Amino acid sequence: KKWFSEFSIMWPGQAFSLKIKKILYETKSKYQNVLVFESTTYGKVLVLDGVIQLTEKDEFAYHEMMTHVPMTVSKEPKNVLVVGGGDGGIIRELCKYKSVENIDICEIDETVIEVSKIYFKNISCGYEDKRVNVFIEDASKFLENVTNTYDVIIVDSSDPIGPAETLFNQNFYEKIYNALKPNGYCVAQCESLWIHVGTIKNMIGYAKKLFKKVEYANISIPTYPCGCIGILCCSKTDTGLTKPNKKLESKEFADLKYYNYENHSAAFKLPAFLLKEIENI
Amino acid sequence: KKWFSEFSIMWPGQAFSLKIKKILYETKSKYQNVLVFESTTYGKVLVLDGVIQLTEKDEFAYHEMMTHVPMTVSKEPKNVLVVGGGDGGIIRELCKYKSVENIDICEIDETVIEVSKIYFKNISCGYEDKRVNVFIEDASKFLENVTNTYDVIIVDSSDPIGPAETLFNQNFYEKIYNALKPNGYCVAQCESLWIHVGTIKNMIGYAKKLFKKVEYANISIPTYPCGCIGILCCSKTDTGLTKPNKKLESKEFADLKYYNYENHSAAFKLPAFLLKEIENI
Ligand SMILES: CSC[C@H]1O[C@@H](n2cnc3c(N)ncnc32)[C@H](O)[C@@H]1O
Ligand SMILES: CSC[C@H]1O[C@@H](n2cnc3c(N)ncnc32)[C@H](O)[C@@H]1O
Ligand SMILES: NCCCN[C@H]1CC[C@H](NCCCN)CC1
Ligand SMILES: NCCCN[C@H]1CC[C@H](NCCCN)CC1
């Protein structure tokens, strides 16, 4: 049996590896190299440009925290945009909210959607929901053109090397600000606090040029580098995203495996050295 | 340049790797294989039987949370025992408390102490403190023979394969209970919640046969498998270890890099699936 190894200039000097049970699919899409394989202990794995995007064993941690942190703070969210997120995990969590009326998703690479529909059926099931509308487009351009404003925007991007290079700059967060309702919220995948704090500092600085409240949360997930990933949290209100406004008690949420009301707030309690680094931003 | 890779039957199918700048020391001690190397991005690394014990870049997360969770809950701790912990990291954090009168450490492998004194001088500096007393002994036997009782016992063991095989059973926690003051606390390194929950369940069951309050906390640390490690927390009082009783404000603690008053409690806010698993223990 061979091993898959995640090497990157984005985290030099370290690598995480998963034993391969079977390779399922590979292709070079218009935008990126796509790899799908069944691992021996983490289930099926999606890889883009050599970087693990998700595994069946732990993806719920990332998709639940990214979705339910902002969706329990927004009081009656009606229109939600997912940027990236071609696998559908965020959509799956969003569909649980009966009050949502529309879910737009802007994914640049249609191959990712199609592969997830074929090989990750318990992750992409939300595409069957009639409220979901798919746009195959660079979100940098979608956000410049969209006429609607959203209650919540969830930025579920790949990393800054590749097509997502357009999603990590000041102009991008200005487009996000303008596409939000006056009381709207944005969360975005953000650098692991064990790697490039300098990047976290850059993103926070960008968001603070526009948003009244900018908070950073941490998620434990073993198959992202250093075992965790941040949530950049942007609010137009000064109350922010640290405290939920509802409990997830209906039957649609009985299956949750990571998120709960107490974890929501706990995710924002950061290690001392990081607090120190972002203090004067 | 070569790479060091951490493979183990204890976490089958996954591995974490660090690029090697230089190998510094290797030996087969009486108990275990010892490896010290300078990594390219995590500083110096200590490896026992192929398993990473610490790196200079992130060890503060584990040593601060293991020490200051129980040391801020105990009100006037006077006598503290470290089990294992030959590298000295726990001792380093304990020495910051001026009120401590005595620190015993029971480490089975004197080679680990000597190697840490030679190659990890900013981790083993606490051995110079006159309150520290070293016992080179199996802690299973030390705990059977010790006449003193302790305010806090910190179990900083290696994994269950090897000399630490005697530290993960019911009889061990009975010895711990008896070596504690009536209001004493024990914390122990415990399995990562992303791997063998069954083991966490076993340890909790053991501790609950004796301790009134048994809690589990999580630490983010990238160079342990799955990026995190648990703290098994055992109290004879029903108030437990989740809430500190003091703030660490004196100058000895100005250098802290992970622990703070809010993180202490946040570490005990666990993912939903784990809460569900331990519910009926
Ligand atoms: C797998 S979830 C991350 C998704 O983000 C998508 N993505 C990357 N860059 C962009 C971009 N500019 N616009 C929209 N989606 C993107 C990637 O194609 C990937 O499927
Ligand atoms: C490096 S910190 C972990 C330490 O736990 C030590 N250790 C392992 N088993 C025991 C044991 N039974 N008694 C005392 N120390 C132990 C190991 O030698 C290691 O140095
Ligand atoms: N919907 C699946 C998630 C896609 N986002 C992932 C977030 C983490 C990233 N690794 C890099 C971590 C350091 N920024 C891969 C894509
Ligand atoms: N004082 C340095 C710490 C020694 N304890 C480590 C704790 C984690 C362990 N990996 C296994 C993690 C799964 N139980 C290595 C030893």
Side-chain angles (χ1 to χ4, degrees), chain B residues 167-187:
Chain B
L167 313 180
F168 290 85
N169 54 70
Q170 180 77 73
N171 169 247
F172 182 69
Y173 278 79
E174 181 171 29
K175 288 166 187 184
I176 293 279
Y177 185 87
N178 291 338
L180 288 170
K181 285 262 193 309
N183 53 342
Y185 303 98
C186 173
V187 296

Side-chain angles (χ1 to χ4, degrees), chain B residues 1-45:
Chain B
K1 286 196 186 54
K2 198 38 226 296
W3 290 74
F4 169 77
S5 295
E6 191 189 51
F7 296 94
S8 176
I9 61 188
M10 292 182 295
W11 36 91
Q14 70 187 71
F16 176 69
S17 300
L18 287 172
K19 199 179 178 191
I20 297 157
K21 189 183 186 177
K22 186 188 204 194
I23 299 193
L24 304 178
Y25 182 76
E26 301 180 79
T27 202
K28 177 160 92 55
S29 80
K30 177 181 178 171
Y31 294 100
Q32 66 212 316
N33 293 317
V34 180
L35 162 68
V36 180
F37 69 93
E38 189 181 10
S39 74
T40 58
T41 57
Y42 280 75
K44 293 181 223 141
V45 181

Side-chain angles (χ1 to χ4, degrees), chain A residues 231-278:
Chain A
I231 308 178
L232 184 68
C233 296
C234 313
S235 296
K236 292 177 176 193
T237 163
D238 210 73
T239 46
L241 279 157
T242 70
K243 310 306 179 201
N245 284 324
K246 56 193 99 151
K247 291 196 182 183
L248 297 176
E249 309 184 335
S250 59
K251 66 165 182 163
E252 294 74 27
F253 302 93
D255 65 343
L256 288 183
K257 288 169 265 323
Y258 190 104
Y259 183 92
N260 63 31
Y261 182 101
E262 291 195 335
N263 292 345
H264 178 145
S265 323
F268 288 84
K269 301 308 186 24
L270 303 176
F273 80 84
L274 176 61
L275 295 178
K276 207 156 268 107
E277 277 273 55
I278 65 193

Side-chain angles (χ1 to χ4, degrees), chain A residues 47-62:
Chain A
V47 179
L48 297 174
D49 291 338
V51 177
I52 298 168
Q53 304 297 300
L54 65 77
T55 81
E56 288 186 286
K57 171 167 174 65
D58 63 357
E59 53 84 10
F60 66 81
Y62 173 79

Side-chain angles (χ1 to χ4, degrees), chain A residues 3 12-19 41-42 57 194 220 222 226 257-258 260 262-263 266 269-273 275, chain B residues 3 12-19 41-42 57 194 220 222 226 257-258 260 262-263 266 269-273 275:
Chain A
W3 290 74
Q14 70 187 71
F16 176 69
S17 300
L18 287 172
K19 199 179 178 191
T41 57
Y42 280 75
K57 171 167 174 65
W194 288 106
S220 166
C226 294
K257 288 169 265 323
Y258 190 104
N260 63 31
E262 291 195 335
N263 292 345
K269 301 308 186 24
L270 303 176
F273 80 84
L275 295 178
Chain B
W3 290 74
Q14 70 187 71
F16 176 69
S17 300
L18 287 172
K19 199 179 178 191
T41 57
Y42 280 75
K57 171 167 174 65
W194 288 106
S220 166
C226 294
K257 288 169 265 323
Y258 190 104
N260 63 31
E262 291 195 335
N263 292 345
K269 301 308 186 24
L270 303 176
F273 80 84
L275 295 178

Side-chain angles (χ1 to χ4, degrees), chain B:
Chain B
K1 286 196 186 54
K2 198 38 226 296
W3 290 74
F4 169 77
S5 295
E6 191 189 51
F7 296 94
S8 176
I9 61 188
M10 292 182 295
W11 36 91
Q14 70 187 71
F16 176 69
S17 300
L18 287 172
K19 199 179 178 191
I20 297 157
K21 189 183 186 177
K22 186 188 204 194
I23 299 193
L24 304 178
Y25 182 76
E26 301 180 79
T27 202
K28 177 160 92 55
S29 80
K30 177 181 178 171
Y31 294 100
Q32 66 212 316
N33 293 317
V34 180
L35 162 68
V36 180
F37 69 93
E38 189 181 10
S39 74
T40 58
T41 57
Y42 280 75
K44 293 181 223 141
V45 181
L46 171 67
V47 179
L48 297 174
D49 291 338
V51 177
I52 298 168
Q53 304 297 300
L54 65 77
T55 81
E56 288 186 286
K57 171 167 174 65
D58 63 357
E59 53 84 10
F60 66 81
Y62 173 79
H63 294 126
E64 298 181 8
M65 295 294 298
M66 288 280 281
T67 306
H68 302 309
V69 156
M71 292 292 291
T72 64
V73 167
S74 189
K75 260 167 274 192
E76 303 105 8
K78 295 310 220 307
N79 198 9
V80 182
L81 174 64
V82 178
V83 166
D87 52 85
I90 301 291
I91 290 164
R92 182 192 66 211
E93 299 298 324
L94 283 176
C95 281
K96 291 165 182 183
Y97 290 91
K98 284 184 296 293
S99 91
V100 165
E101 298 174 352
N102 185 70
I103 296 162
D104 291 340
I105 179 175
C106 182
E107 159 65 65
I108 199 176
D109 191 343
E110 66 177 325
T111 302
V112 169
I113 301 183
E114 297 156 346
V115 157
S116 180
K117 288 181 180 172
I118 290 167
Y119 294 103
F120 295 92
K121 285 177 182 169
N122 310 322
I123 302 174
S124 58
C125 56
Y127 286 112
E128 295 290 64
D129 193 289
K130 269 89 185 185
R131 302 167 283 174
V132 176
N133 292 95
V134 175
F135 304 84
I136 306 291
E137 183 165 6
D138 190 334
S140 171
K141 185 194 174 184
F142 177 97
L143 285 171
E144 170 81 352
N145 290 345
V146 60
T147 66
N148 283 65
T149 54
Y150 296 93
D151 299 297
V152 169
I153 300 179
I154 298 173
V155 181
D156 181 20
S157 59
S158 50
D159 290 308
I161 300 189
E165 64 192 339
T166 61
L167 313 180
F168 290 85
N169 54 70
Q170 180 77 73
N171 169 247
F172 182 69
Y173 278 79
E174 181 171 29
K175 288 166 187 184
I176 293 279
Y177 185 87
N178 291 338
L180 288 170
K181 285 262 193 309
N183 53 342
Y185 303 98
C186 173
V187 296
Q189 173 271 289
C190 197
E191 166 78 306
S192 170
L193 57 85
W194 288 106
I195 315 189
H196 298 142
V197 164
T199 297
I200 297 176
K201 286 158 56 63
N202 292 336
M203 295 303 89
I204 284 168
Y206 298 161
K208 282 183 152 195
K209 278 299 182 181
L210 302 142
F211 289 91
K212 279 331 101 188
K213 201 54 184 97
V214 177
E215 301 154 316
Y216 182 99
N218 191 50
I219 308 174
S220 166
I221 171 159
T223 57
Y224 289 157
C226 294
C228 60
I229 189 60
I231 308 178
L232 184 68
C233 296
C234 313
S235 296
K236 292 177 176 193
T237 163
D238 210 73
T239 46
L241 279 157
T242 70
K243 310 306 179 201
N245 284 324
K246 56 193 99 151
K247 291 196 182 183
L248 297 176
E249 309 184 335
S250 59
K251 66 165 182 163
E252 294 74 27
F253 302 93
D255 65 343
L256 288 183
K257 288 169 265 323
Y258 190 104
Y259 183 92
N260 63 31
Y261 182 101
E262 291 195 335
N263 292 345
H264 178 145
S265 323
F268 288 84
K269 301 308 186 24
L270 303 176
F273 80 84
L274 176 61
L275 295 178
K276 207 156 268 107
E277 277 273 55
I278 65 193
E279 176 184 20
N280 295 115
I281 305 168

